[PDB]
Amino acid sequence: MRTIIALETHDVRFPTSREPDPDYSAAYVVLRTDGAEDLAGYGLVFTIGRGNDVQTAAVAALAEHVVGLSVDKVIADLGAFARRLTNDSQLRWLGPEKGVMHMAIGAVINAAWDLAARAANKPLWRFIAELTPEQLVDTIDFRYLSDALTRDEALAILRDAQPQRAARTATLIEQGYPAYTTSPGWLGYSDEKLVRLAKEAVADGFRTIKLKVGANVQDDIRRCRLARAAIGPDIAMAVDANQRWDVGPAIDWMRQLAEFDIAWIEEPTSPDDVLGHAAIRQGITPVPVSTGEHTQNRVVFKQLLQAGAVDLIQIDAARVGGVNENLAILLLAAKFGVRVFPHAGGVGLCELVQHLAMADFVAITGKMEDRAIEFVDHLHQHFLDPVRIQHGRYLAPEVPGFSAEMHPASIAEFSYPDGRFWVEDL
């Protein structure tokens, strides 16, 4: 009987600040077993430097809950495993289901799913999409959701899609999943660099681009005008304010960019302000509003949808309670007819989130041409299964797992502080 023998945590930090000034980092989690040498679950929480140590401590504090557990028991009931962590009332106090403690639980949960897909020798998106509607529904926590999504409503959705799974899988495997780029929209970029990168993005096949705004309206008006012209009237152009504005200012601001045909304004205000996003959306119609990369859990997503605060949402592989929670968010969006545009970038976020969007297309919505996954070309060289883009689209992962395992030489080089690079640097 194979069991989990250890939950090792690694404080990995990349000096990306030498290339605000975020130093991309990751609280690297590994679920070790005594089975086939190749059996281990990998996961990670994306941090930006300061605090990766506290995030690591949080993950390491979960060891007691996992060491000694039978692997088959875990893999057989991922729902019960996630709930063993989420239901610890004492750990709930540090949240509940938000912040550092929840993200730590999410990474351990993610590693468990990674482990499950590995054992079944399937890429996560396939592992997920090939579970029965009953197996899928049993992994989600319906507490606090019965007013918007019942177990039965979840089952009907998964059952209707059941018949088309084979066709969707073939479609994805040959066509790939759409991607959008944010590479051209950095605020520090000159107008010429903006148009130049915008043009290159289109040439590479991307059909949607996103620019940052929020610092200076005059600047935003000028950059949006230039981007539109450089891109043409057929490419989608979204904007990201990164939580900068209050409600009134956001409305005044966005009304001045509407003319450039905005795909959507992302995070106009605080990620906790459900009613504010609704207010902004109403004040700038028909400019679509989105949020989600920092949304704490499925309950807040529920309210965003209930209040009609969003036109579309982002989901993040590492911000919530792992796969289990994202499935509930995905079912929620599907039920309310709201598109999902996964957030990525950071450290391995693309590698992780691609699977959730792909499982979603096959087993939940069957729609992908109306949306896209974010893509950023960073740190991919540190992963065994790096994402692959082909003319603006993600190629479906083939290797088994969640695509989270990083090259051991990478961990040996950037582990902090014992890492080779950090030992010499300081």
Next chain:
Amino acid sequence: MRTIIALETHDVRFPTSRELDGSDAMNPDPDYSAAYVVLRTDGAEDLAGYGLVFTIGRGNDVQTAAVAALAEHVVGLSVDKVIADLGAFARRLTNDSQLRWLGPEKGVMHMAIGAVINAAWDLAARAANKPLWRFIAELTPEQLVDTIDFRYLSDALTRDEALAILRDAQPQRAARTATLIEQGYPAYTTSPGWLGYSDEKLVRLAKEAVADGFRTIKLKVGANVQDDIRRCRLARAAIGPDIAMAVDANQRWDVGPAIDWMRQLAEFDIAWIEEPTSPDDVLGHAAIRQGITPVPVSTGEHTQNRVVFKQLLQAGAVDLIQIDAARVGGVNENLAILLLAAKFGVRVFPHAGGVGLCELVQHLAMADFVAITGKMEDRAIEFVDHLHQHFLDPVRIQHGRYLAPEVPGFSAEMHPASIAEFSYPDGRFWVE
């Protein structure tokens, strides 16, 4: 130059689960703990700041780690510079991009920031030789407003809207200060109501409390409806019809069930039902409130920040709210919340208990009475009779009322001996 020379932290926890004190529907065996922090400066050793984060056992070590990670931001700062601008000090921590990523303004990292901010206010209070409530209540309306973060609030509470509140109350500050020191502040107790206690114990404690002068008691509910009906009926009979009785479900229910459940308890004359559902479900609370009317609804002990309180008030989701001294971004954030409540006319019943939350929160409610609302007879501060012996300035209850603190500070300082005794895991008591 007086400087902050160190930020020391301690993982302290008490075996409160041995008697099931604090026992409730969501937390069956809490071990009251504290992520204790001390802001050390050079010079008058009597000059340091104290604060803590209340935890209930497991995870208190990571909460402690969270606070220790803030040393870098505070050690080396000029004491005078900190105390002279609490608004800037708070923003230095709150506005840090890498710290915000772990939240922002929620969870472990935020409570860690809130403890350091609270310790800074304690420091400021000491330096001025004033207990925190008077320190706060005596700041000018201008000085007060400059301590809060109005970001994400302009649609509910603008800076000038806040000044109007604080200025109309400045004239009567002296009188109310008198009323407070003479009469004390209304309290209510939760000690008789922990789940886990037998019916016989519930009735004995409920009666003792009334005998002790408490005009309000609170019972934990939420695990089993039959139990709740039975316990509420008995507690009501033990208390008599003139004593208020509130109920606390500790987030256990979904909206639909909460409505069905509470309407069955309504007959026992419920003062308010606290946290019927998830602390993030603003819409859910309003839904529950509309369905169980006229039974009052409250929430707040786990509300992450002022932005969520703003929405609770805008959505008419509560009849009254709790504030907690250690849940948010310290005094600065609590002041904003108190101002929001006053502008929306919703009473505040502070959450207390755990470890030293009574010691801490009493100051906020008292400054509120004096400098903001001028209202205290319509509300009360929670009181639990546990662990007060480990504080140098323990709360003092006089016939169901909190007596105004007199010593300078936030009342957070703990006996060095208590620390040495219950520090985890290498503490003396924890060596068995």
